[PDB]
Ligand binder design. Structure first.
Ligand SMILES: *[C@@H]1O[C@H](CO[C@@H]2O[C@@H](C)[C@@H](O)[C@@H](O)[C@@H]2O)[C@@H](O[C@@H]2O[C@H](CO)[C@@H](O)[C@H](O)[C@H]2NC(C)=O)[C@H](O)[C@H]1NC(C)=O
Ligand SMILES: *[C@@H]1O[C@H](CO)[C@@H](O[C@@H]2O[C@H](CO)[C@@H](O)[C@H](O)[C@H]2NC(C)=O)[C@H](O)[C@H]1NC(C)=O
Ligand code: NAG
Ligand code: NAG
Ligand code: NAG
Ligand code: NAG
Ligand code: NAG
Ligand code: ZN
Lengths: 195, 596
């Protein structure tokens, strides 16, 4: 039996940034919900649409795993119907989202003295993201009426800022690795489910 | 895009950046304060320069959003903070001269030594030596020698510098669209824009005189009592109808009358309330003290301390290998980092200082959600007010009984209450006239009502008429007596102490009324009162987002400063002073001087 490889999307070395969240497909496998309760400390295991207990005896079409790390006081924005810098400009979920959100503290391997400026988020954007959309653009945000012509300067700002995690911040500024799972059902026959 | 969006975006980018730079500066300063080493000094100096450079650059980049097109009052205070010009309005030569004058005055104050008329190799400085003489000596001549020497071998060297400093600061204030430097200082209390909560810069003065008029009688009675009991230690040196000489007040400048408790004790026989022996015999340490103080704050609804507070903070002297500055301070590094640096010992004073510092920490934690520039007290007199009001309840005998100290069959007599009230009055009520006189003198000097050739004459006339203190030796126009104080040699404000002293008792009265307390106000404990915690937290969380008038109204229900709560606290002492002063003269005469 080919088990679902939920061992590389939950235990990788380096996770993606907020503005470049990775998406890995999981299909044609057998569920391993038991090992999911490893890494016992969970800051959140909120689920939507379906109950965690009944997720075992359910067959779907495709399961998507999205991974990124956000600060402590911003985990609340990973949920339907939320507004904020993370929700509007980085990651948006639909109002009818079905799945679970998993978050746990990571201030042991995602922080360093001096600052971990390898994780960055989008701060300014002209529009607001529609649900499930990425944007790896790096143009200069025009905050005025005079064109910037792709350089920095008055009323022209770089869109991406860097967190700078340090291992002495609080439980709201400390890093938190967040993995969200989405369940979709299509006209194709259901295959992704265990015994 | 209107100016509103352009200002909002600029502030939104400034407030991520400032957070990182301030954190790294605060971490460097904390590392220096824990380890006094050359490498740490280098890191502190190298990290406290990027902050200044970035602040100046953003202030220069924030002058293009005029404050008449912006209509949000939350974005108009950040721009007010960021648009201050300071000393940048001056030329390069003027700024260099001002910095040199300030540094020279600070150096002369710090490294200042007076030397004896006797053998000239052994001679002292202020700390220690010139404070031990002023605090623990009963000789009339030695105190006079110290008082005259400090103002003779230091005061001469600041007047030529203070003249140019006054001129340059007035020119800078006028260039920054003000009236003088005193108006610049008063601008902290200025509120405009919000209807019904305005406060002009000139109204602060009038409020100060209005409060001092009501404060006058209690201070006059206390002055008469201190004069009456101070004539026993100096039988032939104090006039029954005159003013108290300046070198007999228990302090170098007479700021506090605390060191007169040994000479002016109401009932000497009865001890005071001390729990040092009880703490020692119960095996108490710094951890126990801070846990009890934490339980005190938990009892009123305020939250716990952060887990990082216990691990990242130093509460005991490291020892001999490490060298640190043993000054009790509360640190708000930002981004969730709260630390307390204090060399705790097993003493009642440290027990109260722990509550004071944790009150500061709670105040800092309250407004962590506000923007960076608004993360401060509403005015310059709330942080100490909160500390003192939270410290006051800890010294009550009932709270001591609650925490298992002091025997549970203690008889709280009606004489230890008088002793405690007089001890509190010697340090709370005896400093308001001094602060008022000093601030009024500096304000009049800045405005120009006092010409340059009348500084000392006006200073001594004001001290004689307001405070009730007469100089022991005549002073000409060559001395500069006010500059001998730390807060005058180093550029600092002084009315914040008066303002905080009036604020603290208003806060205490409001919280005790909210706690359903019955009896005298000085027997009040706010423990086990959720309402008194919510009422305070409603103001603690605002920060600078709202004017100080609204913040004061949110707690005390009033609109401005008041002195009735202060005089209610000292009411039994006031009645006792009337009872004891029946056969004495209440008041002083300006004419009498010791050298007349
Ligand atoms: C603050 O209150 C605690 C808890 O007391 C309880 O809650 C009160 C509101 C009231 O309803 C009491 O009757 C309750 O017992 C006090 O702690 C108790 O103190 C008494 C002293 O008589 C002691 O016998 C109990 O064992 C204590 N309970 C504990 C430690 O859990 C505390 O003394 C109060 N602090 C004050 C009044 O300053
Ligand atoms: C701070 O100082 C700068 C100059 O150092 C001021 O900028 C000038 O202000 C005057 C005032 O009318 C204008 O005429 C100039 O056009 C401004 N720019 C320059 C380059 O001179 C600035 O206004 C000052 N800030 C405040 C709050 O007064
Ligand atoms: C996660 O990876 C680490 C690194 O080798 C390993 O020690 C640990 O056992 C892994 N945990 C799981 C649940 O796979
Ligand atoms: C002021 O700016 C803040 C910043 O978001 C905004 O929430 C608030 O609504 C603004 N005030 C008004 C009256 O619109
Ligand atoms: C504060 O800490 C104590 C002991 O750690 C705990 O019992 C209490 O529940 C905490 N308070 C809150 C509000 O969590
Ligand atoms: C502080 O102590 C010494 C210098 O006194 C220093 O070498 C050491 O690294 C410091 N300890 C810390 C930072 O924990
Ligand atoms: C204290 O109480 C006693 C007993 O009533 C009374 O005689 C005395 O005047 C009161 N005041 C003082 C200061 O002792
Ligand atoms: Zn304080």
């Amino acid at each position: 039996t080919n088990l679902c490889p939920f061992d590389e999307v939950f235990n990788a070395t380096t996770f993606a940034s907020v503005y470049a969240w990775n998406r890995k497909r999981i299909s044609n496998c057998v569920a391993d919900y038991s090992v999911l309760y490893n890494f016992a400390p969970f800051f959140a295991f909120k689920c939507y649409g379906v109950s965690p207990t009944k997720l075992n005896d359910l067959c779907f079409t495709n399961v998507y795993a999205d991974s990124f790390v956000i600060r402590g006081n911003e985990v609340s924005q990973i949920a339907p119907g939320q507004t904020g810098n993370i929700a509007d400009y980085n990651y948006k979920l639909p109002d009818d989202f079905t799945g679970c959100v998993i978050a746990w503290n990571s201030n042991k391997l995602d922080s360093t003295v001096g600052g971990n400026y390898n994780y960055r988020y989008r701060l300014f954007r002209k529009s607001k993201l529609k649900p499930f959309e990425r944007d790896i653009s790096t143009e200069i945000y025009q905050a005025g009426n005079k064109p910037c012509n792709g350089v920095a300067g008055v009323n022209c700002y770089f869109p991406l800022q860097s967190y700078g995690f340090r291992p002495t911040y609080g439980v709201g500024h400390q890093p938190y690795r967040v993995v969200v799972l989405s369940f979709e059902l299509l006209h194709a026959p259901a295959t992704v489910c265990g015994p | 895009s209107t100016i509103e969006e352009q200002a909002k975006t600029f502030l939104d980018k400034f407030n991520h950046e400032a957070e990182d730079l301030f954190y790294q500066s605060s971490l460097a300063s904390w590392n220096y304060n824990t380890n006094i080493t050359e490498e740490n000094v280098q890191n502190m100096n190298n990290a406290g320069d990027k902050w200044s450079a970035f602040l100046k650059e953003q202030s220069t980049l924030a002058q293009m959003y005029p404050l008449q097109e912006i209509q949000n009052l939350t974005v108009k205070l950040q721009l007010q903070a960021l648009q201050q010009n300071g000393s940048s309005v001056l030329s390069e030569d003027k700024s260099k001269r001002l910095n040199t004058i300030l540094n020279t005055m600070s150096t002369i104050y710090s490294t200042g030594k007076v030397c004896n008329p006797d053998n000239p190799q052994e001679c002292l400085l202020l700390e220690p030596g010139l404070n031990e003489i002023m605090a623990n000596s009963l000789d009339y001549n030695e105190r006079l020698w110290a008082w005259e020497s400090w103002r003779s071998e230091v005061g001469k060297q600041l007047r030529p510098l203070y003249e140019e400093y006054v001129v340059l600061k007035n020119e800078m204030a006028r260039a920054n669209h003000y009236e003088d430097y005193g108006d610049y200082w008063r601008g902290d209390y200025e509120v405009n824009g919000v209807d019904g909560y305005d406060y002009s810069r000139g109204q602060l003065i009038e409020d100060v005189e209005h409060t001092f008029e009501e404060i006058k009688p209690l201070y006059e009675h206390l002055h008469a009592y201190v004069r009456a009991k101070l004539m026993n230690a100096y039988p032939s040196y104090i006039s029954p109808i005159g003013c108290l000489p300046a070198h007999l007040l228990g302090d170098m400048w007479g700021r506090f009358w605390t060191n007169l408790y040994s000479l002016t004790v109401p009932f000497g026989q009865k001890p005071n309330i001390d729990v040092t022996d009880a703490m020692v015999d119960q095996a108490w340490d710094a951890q126990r003290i801070f846990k009890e103080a934490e339980k005190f704050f938990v009892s009123v609804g305020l939250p716990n301390m952060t887990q990082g507070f216990w691990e990242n903070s130093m509460l005991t002297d490291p020892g001999n290998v490490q060298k640190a500055v043993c000054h009790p301070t509360a640190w708000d590094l930002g981004k969730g980092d709260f630390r307390i640096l204090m060399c705790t010992k097993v003493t009642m004073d440290d027990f109260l200082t722990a509550h004071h510092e944790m009150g500061h920490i709670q105040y800092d934690m309250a407004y962590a959600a506000q923007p960076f520039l608004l993360r401060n007290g509403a005015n310059e007199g709330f942080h100490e007010a909160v500390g003192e009001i939270m410290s006051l309840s800890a010294a009550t005998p009932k709270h001591l009984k609650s925490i298992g100290l002091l025997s549970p069959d203690f008889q709280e007599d009606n004489e230890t209450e008088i002793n405690f009230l007089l001890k509190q009055a010697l340090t709370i009520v005896g400093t308001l006239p001094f602060t008022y006189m000093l601030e009024k003198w500096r304000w009049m000097v800045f405005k120009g009502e006092i010409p340059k050739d009348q500084w000392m004459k006006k200073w001594w006339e004001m001290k004689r008429e307001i405070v009730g203190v007469v100089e022991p030796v005549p002073h000409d126009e060559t001395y500069c007596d006010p500059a001998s104080l730390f807060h005058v040699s180093n550029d600092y404000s002084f009315i914040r102490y008066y303002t905080r002293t009036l604020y603290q008792f208003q806060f205490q009265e409001a919280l005790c009324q909210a706690a359903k307390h019955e009896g005298p106000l000085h027997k009040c404990d706010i423990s086990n009162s959720t309402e008194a915690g919510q009422k305070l937290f409603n103001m603690l969380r605002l920060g600078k987002s709202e004017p100080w008038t609204l913040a004061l109204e949110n707690v005390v229900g009033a609109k401005n400063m008041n002195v009735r709560p202060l005089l209610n606290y000292f009411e039994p002492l006031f009645t006792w002073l009337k009872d004891q002063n029946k056969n004495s003269f209440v008041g002083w005469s300006t004419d009498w001087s010791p050298y007349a």
